Design a binder for this molecule. Structure first.
Ligand SMILES: CC(C)CCC[C@@H](C)[C@H]1CC[C@H]2[C@@H]3CC=C4C[C@@H](O)CC[C@]4(C)[C@H]3CC[C@]12C
Ligand SMILES: CC(C)CCC[C@@H](C)[C@H]1CC[C@H]2[C@@H]3CC=C4C[C@@H](O)CC[C@]4(C)[C@H]3CC[C@]12C
Lengths: 56, 225, 232, 274, 338
């Protein structure tokens, strides 16, 4: 019956609970580093010159 | 200009594609799209056969009007989350089973089958998208409905029913209940029909219902209503 | 995919003849259609072009007025109504398809051709290489020069490369001066600077024997080159 | 003698005020729709075009009348009434054929009939009304030519002038009106067939009669005797302006009542007033 | 016992919650405090791709960032030349009810899917010159919601039957099927590295999958309604979720918890389409109020609004170079922003 489904859910929870997790400080730092490292190459964020823009 | 020969040829190809798109859109404007919905048994197979996978589209012409049905009984998912794709359909062919006042679902025996039918009907009528999408109600399975109402009374499904066990009174009360479920009566209409399995008049009734959806949509587009 | 043609044969000067082109294997309506003729022992020359839907119809200077081009999309056939023939028109004509959109491959397929015998401002291309012997496994560079730069403002060069094997029909090698056609081996490569262009063959075999032609599509009076013959 | 003339003066100023109120109501509502990015349909675009034409005609005729009464001397110049007749003819042709084109929109969309070209017309009603406007332009050319000919026939020599311009204008304005007559009758016939069909199966019309009460009253005022019993010129100009007012003034309010969108705008304005 | 198994599952969920709380030493908002604000981000409609005659339920950008395919209820797939407004192809569809469309990375194939429960792969580079369907993938018991091409032979499809699957195009069979979502899956995002892909469903939970394993790695909660759109952060180690509760949420796979909630009091309608910019500094979202608000991922402060659509923005895509943004909506018009 649903006992097999419960066992599968428990196994999945064990798999999801043993994952290595870093603190959100390092995660936010990495995301910020990626955002700033590609800030120059972002036409949406930093507008490009009209000549370079192909959507004139 | 400043367009190369290949650029101009591509622009002409785009113009031809736009011409074909406009032709297909004009053809589809004359087309009529109907959403076939039902609950419980719903007798929708009888309507599909008479009036002619996850979705089925039964196309049929009646009096120089192309019709497009879309039965979504096999979808089996959250109706709210794909019901928005049908915002703009001409009408909804809802199908209730008039003879399910005694039949009950396998699970939840407390709730009758037609109570679930009215729950779904109230869900679809008062839906956020279909405020003006009229519903062609189809009260099917009339024969064995009369058979059952000969023996069992309609009170067993509604304690509020106070009328003779005749077919006409019970049918009128069910129609009145379903029409009273229409909360927003000032925008959309309910068209009711007891399935007539003689000479295919159901196609005709759907034709008149669709003609009024077309006429009132023209009036709304023209602002007269 | 086939573009066989009919008609042809002996004709008296000043007469009229119709050249047909049966098309099978592709959606004929979607491709603009071309007529390129090849005189007995000289280069290819563009005659007429009809577009998808026949909205755009262009002719060459010599065939202006005398010739008319028409297509029957339901019949999947192409016509070239030729009137007032002269001894200049004696050539075996080719029926060529060309679809036009972003990233398309114009002049991808060439018909076998029908021989015609008549009784006795435009961009120029020079291919002075003429005849050059080659050996298997070697590498050669075929040179083509255009009087006017083929680099349009949209960023595409419009030089095409064709290869005509002895007795066979021309086959597209490179379109847009850089892009490799469909089915051609990767050894063939194309490069250019806008007015001077070259085509490189990494390794040659018996199938590379023939004469190579360069074409433009920048301005529709399309012109070929003299031809670069590669013997063995 | 003079009391009736003062009553007609008040009637004309009230008609001008009502015309401004109505046409400006349509114009302002459509301007609000345009500035706010709200959807603009063909009906409301024709509404505002017709309102602009009607306000132009109303301003033209009423300003010309205020010009006349303050100084009849400059009204009594032949070039003036030639120019006024020409400008009135063009603005009237625009207004009447815009109303007829609106009727054509209604007939092509609402009505259901059997014709192969009917579907083409129903799907290209914009091009159909544009073709109607081309016929309108050629008709306007013919009308202005004939009225110019009558104007020269008068210059070579104003009861006869009144007969000429009223005859020509009425004959050349009844054609779009008669076409709209037949078209409206056909639309009502189609609606009656549909309603009867589901009687078996199971604001415009009232406002039309409301407008035509006043329309018949105004027409009986002047048009009946304009061709039979010539009146005094002082009475002729005032009644001519009364007719110039009759349709474009009140029919604008009738158009407000017929359309639901302007009706809702008017209800919102009334709520704002209180 | 079933009760014992449920108690064990509850204990494991509590352990996961405790670990997630222990990982949350500092919030992303506190870290993103001295960061210079994005400012007022404003674009105009550079291109208005028009020709669609029904609501546009999907749109994808090609790898070249010039060819764009759009799926609409009219039954037509249109490949647009964004640089010069052109229709490269107009693919007719057997099912007009299409909710998803995907452009293959190589540009040779395009996929569409919807209430037909079929992912139709269309071949564009055919010798016949007309677009033809290469394969019709069938086997999903629910409506197709999102499809994304791993390559010319592999596609990952999210369906409303609470499952996602990896398809093999040449065989047409499901190499691996992903199961574990309780509600209908609506959007899937392929990681830039293509090893993993995340999907959001109606159970208010997003799950990161492994395409070569088939097991859910991490599940992320926090939403109170159906997650409608999902997109991977360009880093590939984070993703953003749009839900019907009028808030966007950015999750991270190295901490498996929410990092920032993009919510405003004015907006009550849910998010229909979520897409990131090239650097991740902009979390473009498509709302049901006929608008597309440009968010800032690091600081949940609105940067701009992409007003200009008369109906709801249903699809939203950013080019591979970050040059343009497409805001296809139910008004039957696509708009390109810059
Ligand atoms: C009742 C129906 C038939 C409508 C009849 C309207 C007639 C009688 C009225 C309406 C408006 C009037 C016109 C309004 C203004 C001018 C310009 C003036 O310089 C000469 C008279 C002239 C040209 C009028 C002639 C009479 C006229 C055409
Ligand atoms: C807003 C749109 C409809 C403007 C078009 C003008 C409409 C309101 C007017 C113009 C001419 C009118 C018709 C002219 C005359 C008659 C005869 C009368 O005994 C009954 C009404 C009837 C049959 C009218 C119906 C309404 C009508 C068509």
């Amino acid at each position: 019956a649903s006992i097999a489904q419960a066992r599968k859910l428990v196994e999945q929870l064990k798999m999801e609970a043993n994952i290595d997790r870093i603190k959100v400080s390092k995660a936010a730092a990495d995301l910020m580093a990626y955002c700033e490292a590609h800030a120059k190459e972002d036409p949406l964020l930093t507008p490009v010159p009209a000549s370079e823009n192909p959507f004139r | 200009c400043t367009l190369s020969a290949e650029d101009k040829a591509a622009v002409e190809r785009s113009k031809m594609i736009d011409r074909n798109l406009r032709e297909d859109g004009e053809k589809a404007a004359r087309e009529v799209k109907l959403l076939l919905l039902g609950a419980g048994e719903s007798g929708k197979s009888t309507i599909v056969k008479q009036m002619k996978t996850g979705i089925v589209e039964t196309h049929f012409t009646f009096k120089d009007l192309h019709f497009k049905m879309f039965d979504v009984g096999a979808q089996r998912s959250e109706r709210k989350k794909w019901i928005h794709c049908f915002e703009g359909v001409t009408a909804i062919i809802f199908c209730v089973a008039l003879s399910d006042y005694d039949l009950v679902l396998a699970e939840d025996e407390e709730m009758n089958r037609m109570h679930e039918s009215m729950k779904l009907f109230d869900s679809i009528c008062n839906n956020k998208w279909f405020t003006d999408t009229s519903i062609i109600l189809f009260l099917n399975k009339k024969d064995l409905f009369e058979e059952k109402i000969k023996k069992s009374p309609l009170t067993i499904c509604y304690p509020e029913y106070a009328g003779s066990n005749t077919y006409e009174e019970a049918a009128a009360y069910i129609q009145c209940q379903f029409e009273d479920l229409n909360k927003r009566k000032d925008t959309k209409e309910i068209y009711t029909h007891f399935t007539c399995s003689t000479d295919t008049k159901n196609v005709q009734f759907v034709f008149d219902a669709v003609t009024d959806v077309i006429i009132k949509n023209n009036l709304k587009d023209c602002g007269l209503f | 995919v086939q573009l066989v043609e009919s008609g042809g044969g002996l004709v008296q000067p000043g007469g009229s003849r119709k050249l047909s082109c049966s098309a099978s294997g592709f959606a004929f309506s979607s491709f603009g259609m071309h007529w390129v003729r090849q005189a007995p022992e000289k280069g290819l020359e563009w005659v007429a072009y009809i577009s998808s839907g026949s909205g755009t119809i262009y002719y060459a200077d010599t065939v202006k007025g005398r010739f008319t081009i028409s297509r029957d999309d339901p019949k999947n056939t192409l016509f070239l109504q030729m009137t007032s023939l002269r001894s200049e028109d004696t050539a075996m004509y080719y029926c060529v398809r060309s679809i036009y959109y972003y990233g398309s491959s114009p002049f991808d397929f060439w018909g076998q051709g029908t021989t015609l015998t008549v009784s006795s401002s435009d961009i120029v291309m020079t291919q002075a290489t003429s005849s050059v012997p080659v050996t298997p496994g070697e590498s050669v560079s075929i040179s083509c020069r255009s009087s006017k730069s083929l680099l349009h403002s949209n960023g595409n060069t419009y030089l095409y490369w064709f290869l005509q094997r002895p007795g066979q029909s021309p086959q597209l090698l490179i379109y847009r001066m850089s892009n490799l056609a469909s089915g051609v081996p990767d050894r063939f490569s194309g490069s250019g600077s806008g007015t001077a262009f070259t085509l490189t063959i990494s390794r040659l075999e018996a199938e590379d024997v023939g004469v190579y032609y360069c074409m433009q599509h920048l301005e529709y009076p399309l012109t070929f080159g003299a031809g670069t013959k590669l013997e063995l | 003698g003079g009391v009736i003339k003062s009553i007609f003066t008040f009637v004309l100023i009230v008609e001008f005020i009502i015309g401004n109120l109505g046409n400006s109501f349509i114009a302002l509502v459509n301007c609000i729709d345009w500035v706010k990015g709200r959807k603009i349909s063909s009906v409301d675009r024709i509404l505002t075009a017709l309102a602009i034409s009607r306000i132009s005609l109303v301003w033209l005729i009423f300003g010309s009348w205020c010009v006349s009464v303050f100084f009849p001397a400059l009204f009594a110049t032949e070039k003036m009434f030639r120019m006024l007749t020409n400008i009135w003819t063009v603005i009237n042709h625009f207004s009447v054929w815009l109303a007829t084109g609106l009727g054509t929109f209604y007939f092509l969309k609402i009505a259901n009939f059997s014709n192969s070209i009917f579907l083409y017309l129903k799907w290209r009603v914009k091009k159909v009304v544009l073709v109607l406007l081309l016929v309108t332009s050629v008709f306007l050319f013919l009308n202005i030519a004939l009225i110019n000919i009558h104007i020269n026939a008068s210059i070579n020599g104003f009861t006869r002038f009144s007969s000429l311009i009223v005859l020509t204008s009425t004959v050349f304005i009844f054609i779009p009106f008669t076409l709209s007559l037949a078209m409206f009758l056909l639309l009502i016939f189609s609606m009656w067939k549909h309603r009867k069909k589901m009687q078996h199966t199971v604001r415009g019309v009232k406002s039309v009669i409301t407008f035509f009460l006043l329309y018949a009253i105004f027409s009986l005022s002047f048009f009946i005797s304009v061709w039979t019993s010539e009146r005094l010129e002082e009475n002729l100009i005032i009644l001519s302006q009364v007719m110039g007012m009759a349709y474009p003034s009140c029919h604008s309010c009738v158009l407000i009542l017929g359309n639901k969108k302007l009706r809702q705008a008017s209800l919102s304005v009334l709520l704002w007033l209180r | 016992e079933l009760d014992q198994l449920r108690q064990e599952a509850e204990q494991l969920k509590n352990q996961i919650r405790d670990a997630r709380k222990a990982c949350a030493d500092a919030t992303l908002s506190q870290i993103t405090n001295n960061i210079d604000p994005v400012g007022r981000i404003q674009m105009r409609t550079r291109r208005t791709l028009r020709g669609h005659l029904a609501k546009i339920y999907a749109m994808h950008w090609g790898t070249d960032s010039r060819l764009l395919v759009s799926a609409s209820q009219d039954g037509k797939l249109i490949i647009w030349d964004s640089y010069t407004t052109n229709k490269v192809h107009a693919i007719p569809l057997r099912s007009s009810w299409v909710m998803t469309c995907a452009y293959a990375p190589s540009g040779n194939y395009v996929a569409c899917g919807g209430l037909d429960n079929i992912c139709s792969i269309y071949n564009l580079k055919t010798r016949e010159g007309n677009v033809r369907v290469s394969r019709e993938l069938a086997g999903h018991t629910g409506y197709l919601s999102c499809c994304r091409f791993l390559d010319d032979n592999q596609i990952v499809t999210s369906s409303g039957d609470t499952t996602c699957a990896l398809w093999d195009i040449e065989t047409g069979q499901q190499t691996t099927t992903f199961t574990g979502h309780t509600g209908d899956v609506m959007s899937l995002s392929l990681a830039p590295d293509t090893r993993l892909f995340v999907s959001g469903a109606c159970d208010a939970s997003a799950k990161l999958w492994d395409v070569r394993e088939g097991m859910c790695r991490q599940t992320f909660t926090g939403h109170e309604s159906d997650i409608n759109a999902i997109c991977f952060f360009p880093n590939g180690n984070a993703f953003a979720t749009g839900s019907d509760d009028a808030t966007c949420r950015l999750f991270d796979l190295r901490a498996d918890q929410e990092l920032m909630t993009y919510s405003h009091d004015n907006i009550i309608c849910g998010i229909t389409s979520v897409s990131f910019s090239k650097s991740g500094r902009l979390l473009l979202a498509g709302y049901d109020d006929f608008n597309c608000n440009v968010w800032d991922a690091l600081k949940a402060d609105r940067a701009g609004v992409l007003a200009g659509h008369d109906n709801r923005v249903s699809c939203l895509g950013v080019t591979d170079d970050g040059m343009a943004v497409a805001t296809g909506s139910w008004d039957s018009f696509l708009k390109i922003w810059n």
